[PDB]
Amino acid sequence: QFPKLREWIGQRVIKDMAAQGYQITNKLFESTVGVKRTDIEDDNLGVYGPL
Amino acid sequence: QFPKLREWIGQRVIKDMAAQGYQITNKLFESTVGVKRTDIEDDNLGVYGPL
Amino acid sequence: AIITPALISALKTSFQKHFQDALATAPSTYLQVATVIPSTTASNTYGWLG
Numbered sequence: 001q002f003p004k005l006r007e008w009i010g011q012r013v014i015k016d017m018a019a020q021g022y023q024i025t026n027k028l029f030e031s032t033v034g035v036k037r038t039d040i041e042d043d044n045l046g047v048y049g050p051l
Numbered sequence: 052q053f054p055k056l057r058e059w060i061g062q063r064v065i066k067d068m069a070a071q072g073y074q075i076t077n078k079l080f081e082s083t084v085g086v087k088r089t090d091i092e093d094d095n096l097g098v099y100g101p102l
Numbered sequence: 103a104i105i106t107p108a109l110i111s112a113l114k115t116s117f118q119k120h121f122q123d124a125l126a127t128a129p130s131t132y133l134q135v136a137t138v139i140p141s142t143t144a145s146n147t148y149g150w151l152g
Contacts, residue, residue, distance in 0.1 A: 019104035073121070076110050 003015040033051075035041070040048055054066040084102075091099055104113070139146070 016103065019108065021105045021108045023107060071121075074115070 002017070003013075006013065035048060035051075040046060053068065086099070086102075107113075
C-alpha cells in the first residue's frame with residue numbers, strides 16, 4: 001500500500017514501500033482405463049459408449 | 052553436445068545431455084564537472100568551447 | 103523492498119542465446135585419408151589377381 005496522507009508542515013516526507021512474492025510448482029496427474037476391443041468396439045457400444 | 056554414436060549391441064540405451072548458464076549484471080556509472088555560467092559566458096578566449 | 107526471488111535474479115533478467123552453437127568441432131578430414139565405397143547388402147568382398 002501507499003503511505004497514508006499527511007498534512008503539510010514544512011517539508012515533504014519521502015517514505016518507502018515494499019513488495020511481496022509467492023511461488024508455486026506444478027503437478028502432473030492422470031487416470032487410465034483398460035478395455036478390450038471385442039467387448040464393445042467391434043460388437044456394440046452398449047457400455048463405455050459415454051466413455 | 053550429444054553422446055557419440057556407438058555400436059548397436061545388446062539393447063538400446065537412452066542417454067541425456069547437459070545445459071549450461073551464465074549471468075552478469077549491469078553497473079551504473081557517472082561523471083560530472085561544475086562551472087559557473089558567468090565564467091563560461093564571460094569567455095572570449097574560445098577555450099572551454101569543447102567541454 | 104521487493105523480495106530477492108523477484109529481483110535481478112529472475113524478475114529483472116533477459117535470456118540470450120549468443121553462446122549457442124559457437125564452439126565448433128574439428129573439421130572433417132577422413133576424406134583426405136580414406137575413400138568411400140557404397141554397399142547394398144550384409145557385407146562386401148574384394149578380390150584381385152596378382
